[PDB]
Design a protein around this ligand. Structure first.
Ligand code: GTP
Ligand code: MG
Lengths: 349, 160
């Protein structure tokens, strides 16, 4: 009786945590929450999110700098619904959106019912929920700004080539899966030992050809697959994809947390469990004006503060920035163009 | 009872602010402006004022002195390289006409640490030992655990 878009907003509104749902309910909520995606916000906004469901409903949320919420829903049957509302304390609709907030400390979330951190797969799935949740800005710092340092982006193409195949990756809402991802790695010229992309990929983006295959093998709608193709075929695409995998974006957040990170890392080796270091999750959007916006998340395991012994959770680092139209995938250019915003979340069970 | 927490940056003031405000320790960020929050403890509503302790924005705290009733000076007991840089800020703080007469809690915070400076040495290394006409109590604490804090409240409360 409802479109996916109406359901999500209602759930988001009631309380994405309010302990009542029948697991079958939560499980189907996380599902819906996955298609929700951060997009380029206006200068007067905290941020903006957008979703396109497999029932043709669509959800757009704006949050103005004054934590004021504006929602638009378009249904299965061409109904237009505008909602005005404030996230407060009970809803905290704000906590349940992938937006950056100004706060004295790192925002703490809780996970849903039966979410665990016990293996590599339960981790990508925690990130799958944390990456749609709110974060706290870490104010710029020359000392921790990885773009401030002497080796800016030095590992870009290694992290890319490495993270590709083994990330959650979304292009304009379309899910790029592992094979399409390796296909995109080859498409960039990056299965290679440690070369850079082709002077072709740079300057021309990918080929129509590789692009079509990639989108072909990827999950979503035809109209959406067409945006993917057209996005791939600019060089800014490469810039945006490659920079998104950049590993040092996490430095500011790790700067704040490194000992409880070390503890989490040690804490697992005592057990003999083998879950990985980081879990990577990336959302890229080109809006119709052709603006490109990146939200890149790295999840890393981390111990709770000493007042909560033996409790482990996840530290979710969000890095967000536009890739201005004119910036090709070379170091000096990305060092000067990109203005990464850094923000972090901690999520526990 | 309006309270004003002062200290050098990275001492753990903000952390103590939310250890007390939320009840559970959080991961703080360099406080740029200020925080203020209220805490009822034992029927007493402290009103604590957190202001950035970075070398930079230090002389803006005087803008806060008028009203204070207790100077929680919070201390990083591992950093010994600014032990002096901080044994001084203390004297300048309460000397200023604003804070002439006011009880003085001293949080020997960060005790859980290895090279944790003992509570008495704190008293010594600040210069607290040779001072009278003045309520000054030293409180060993861990801000991330909660140790000492709610015992230090006891002193603020009690001794006022
Ligand atoms: N080991 C240890 N670390 C602590 C303790 N209390 C606070 N810290 C840490 O020290 C760092 C500084 O704490 P903050 O409360 O943000 O420092 P601040 O005093 O507010 O400094 P500013 O924000 O610049 O004004 C934080 O990362 C805290 O987690 C403690 O008792 N023991
Ligand atoms: Mg602070």
């Amino acid at each position: 009786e409802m479109s996916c878009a109406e359901k999500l907003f209602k759930v988001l509104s009631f309380g994405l945590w309010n302990p009542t749902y029948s697991r079958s309910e939560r499980q189907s909520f996380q599902e819906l929450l996955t298609v929700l995606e951060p997009v380029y916000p206006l200068p007067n906004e905290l941020g903006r999110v957008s979703a396109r469901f497999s029932d043709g409903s669509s959800l757009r949320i704006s949050v103005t700098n004054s934590e004021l919420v504006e929602a638009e829903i378009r249904t299965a049957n061409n109904e237009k619904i505008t909602v005005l509302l404030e996230s407060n304390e009970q809803n905290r609709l704000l906590q349940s959106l992938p937006i950056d907030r100004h706060m004295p400390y790192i925002q703490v979330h809780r996970a849903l019912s039966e979410m665990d951190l016990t293996d590599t797969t339960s981790m990508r799935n925690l990130l799958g929920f944390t990456s749609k949740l709110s974060t706290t800005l870490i104010p710029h710092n020359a000392q921790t700004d990885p773009l401030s340092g002497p080796t800016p982006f030095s590992s870009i193409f290694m992290d890319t080539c490495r993270g590709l195949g083994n990330a959650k990756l979304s292009l304009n809402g379309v899910d790029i899966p592992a094979n399409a991802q390796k296909l995109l790695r080859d498409a960039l010229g990056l299965k290679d030992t440690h070369s850079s992309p082709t002077r072709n990929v740079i300057d021309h983006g990918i080929s129509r050809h590789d692009a079509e295959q990639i989108a072909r093998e990827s999950s979503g709608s035809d109209k959406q697959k067409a945006e993917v193709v057209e996005f791939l075929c600019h060089p800014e695409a490469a810039t945006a994809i490659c920079s998104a995998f950049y590993q040092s974006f996490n430095v500011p957040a790790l700067t704040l947390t490194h000992e409880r990170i070390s503890k989490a890392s040690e804490y697992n080796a005592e057990r003999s469990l083998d879950t990985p270091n980081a879990c990577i999750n990336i959302s890229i959007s080109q809006s119709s004006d052709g603006n490109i916006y990146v939200t890149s998340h790295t999840g890393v395991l981390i111990m709770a503060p000493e007042d909560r012994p033996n409790e482990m959770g996840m530290l979710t680092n969000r890095t967000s920035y536009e890739v201005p139209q004119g910036v090709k995938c070379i170091i000096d250019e990305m060092v000067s163009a990109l203005q990464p915003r850094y923000a972090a979340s901690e999520t526990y069970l | 009872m309006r309270i004003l927490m002062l200290g050098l940056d990275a001492a753990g003031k903000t952390t103590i602010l939310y250890k007390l405000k939320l009840g559970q320790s959080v991961t703080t960020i360099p406080t740029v402006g200020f925080n203020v929050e209220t805490v009822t403890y034992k029927n007493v509503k402290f009103n604590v004022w957190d202001v950035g302790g970075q070398d930079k924005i230090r002389p803006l705290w005087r803008h806060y002195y008028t009203g204070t009733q207790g100077l929680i000076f919070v201390v990083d007991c591992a950093d010994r390289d600014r032990i002096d840089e901080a044994r001084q800020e203390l004297h300048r703080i309460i000397n200023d006409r604003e804070m002439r007469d006011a009880i003085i809690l001293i949080f020997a915070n960060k005790q859980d640490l290895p090279d944790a400076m003992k509570p008495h040495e704190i008293q010594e290394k600040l210069g607290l030992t040779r001072i009278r006409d003045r309520n000054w109590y030293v409180q060993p604490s861990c801000a991330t655990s909660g140790d000492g804090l709610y015992e230090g409240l006891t002193w603020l409360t009690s001794n006022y």
